[PDB]
Amino acid sequence: LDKNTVHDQEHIMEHLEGVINKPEAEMSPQELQLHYFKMHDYDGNNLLDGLELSTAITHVHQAPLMSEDELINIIDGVLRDDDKNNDGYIDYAEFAKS
């Protein structure tokens, strides 16, 4: 979960299209991050987990599918330093904290 992976505008801008269409290229770093947290929580539990993040970083947008070991390593590195309550989930408290 690098900073530039979440602080890019075109991905989220083409992502919210279909239900909400407000083109505005003056978003704060805490705005597009919030949108990123909102749309990737598919279960509607206002919470991010390993599967949702794994589908986030792979996605459907050509490039070869990533290695299972590499995906496991990167998601374990993400969950190791970001999760604070050791719940297996990632909240926006932990997400914005790191």
Partner: protein, 313 residues
């Protein structure tokens, strides 16, 4: 106990299948058909066997798995059924509910066909095996049954949920009957004590079909690691002053409310059925009657306790 979500031993929609046509961190074989919404472990065809097994082994002292599944049949009699395994190695093929025999672990069998002719089926049977006992398919494993409950899980209006918990050498199988869309409406089905399973094992699901045919769909499989409240180290001074969470939470609630408000007028900015809605209303009415009766039972148990306290004086 404290619950930790484990993504490595879990699959869930709506993005269950990756781009290459496989489920992450799980290995499927046989007639299992993985889709985005669910995995069809055994389609409604004659002589179908399927299984989805985890790739990496799990080292969990105490665990909890929540499995959501549907068994859909055209007729009133179905075969063969579903199975949830915690084993030592992935079978991935075999005659025991679509998986191998002589498994080293615990298998929960959702048997739908009565091969013993005793009208007990459909049943949920807990069978453990060290690796030297063959599963008795001809009589639904009644002689080797550690525990069994008689619940129906076929053609329910809502997906059937099942919580299997192994916490301090006892295995508990709780079943949602599938008459309500709530995901936390579990009911007690069976339990066993002093259950011994290997600490290293693979989680898996499987399904088999005989002459009669059902669709055995699995929508989700959430594996949770359970840790004791005393053995877990706290490691304090890691919440970062606890104030940023309270500074962020109300702002995020306000933004999600305003996003809902934006979606409210953008739903109608640029644009259920009768009978189906009536069926939903009927099922909601049945659920409300059930909840009222349960509440009355709880109030009468409180009445019980209070009368006994007065009796003691």
């Amino acid at each position: 106990p404290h619950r930790r979500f484990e993504y490595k031993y879990s699959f869930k929609g709506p993005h269950l299948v990756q781009s290459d046509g496989t489920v992450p961190f799980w290995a499927h074989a046989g007639n299992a058909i993985p889709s985005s919404d669910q995995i069809r472990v055994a389609p409604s065809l004659k002589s179908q066997r399927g299984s989805v097994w985890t790739k990496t082994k799990a080292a969990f002292e105490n665990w909890e798995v929540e499995v959501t599944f549907r068994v859909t049949g055209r007729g009133r009699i179905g075969a063969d059924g579903l199975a949830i395994w915690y084993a030592e190695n992935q079978g991935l093929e075999g005659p025991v509910f679509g998986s191998a025999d002589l498994w080293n672990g615990v298998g929960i069998f959702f048997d739908s066909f009565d091969n013993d002719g005793k009208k007990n089926n459909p049943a949920i049977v807990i069978i453990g095996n060290n690796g030297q006992i063959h599963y008795d398919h001809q009589n639904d494993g009644a002689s080797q049954a550690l525990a069994s409950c008689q619940r129906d899980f076929r053609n329910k209006p809502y997906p059937v949920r099942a919580k299997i918990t192994y916490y301090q050498n006892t295995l508990t199988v709780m079943i949602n009957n599938g008459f309500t869309p709530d995901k936390n409406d579990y009911e007690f089905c069976a339990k066993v004590e002093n259950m011994i399973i290997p600490a290293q094992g693979h989680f898996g699901i499987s399904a088999a079909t005989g002459g009669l045919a059902d669709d055995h769909d699995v929508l989700s499989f959430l594996t949770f690691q359970l840790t004791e409240p005393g053995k877990e180290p706290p490691t304090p001074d890691k919440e970062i002053s606890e104030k940023e969470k309270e500074k962020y939470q109300e702002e995020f609630e306000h933004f999600q409310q305003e996003l809902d408000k934006k979606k409210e007028e953008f739903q109608k900015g640029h644009p259920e059925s009768v009978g189906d809605r009536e069926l939903r209303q009927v099922f909601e009415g049945q659920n409300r009657i059930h909840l009222e009766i349960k509440q009355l039972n709880r109030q009468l148990d409180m009445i019980l306790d209070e009368q006994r306290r007065y009796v003691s004086s």
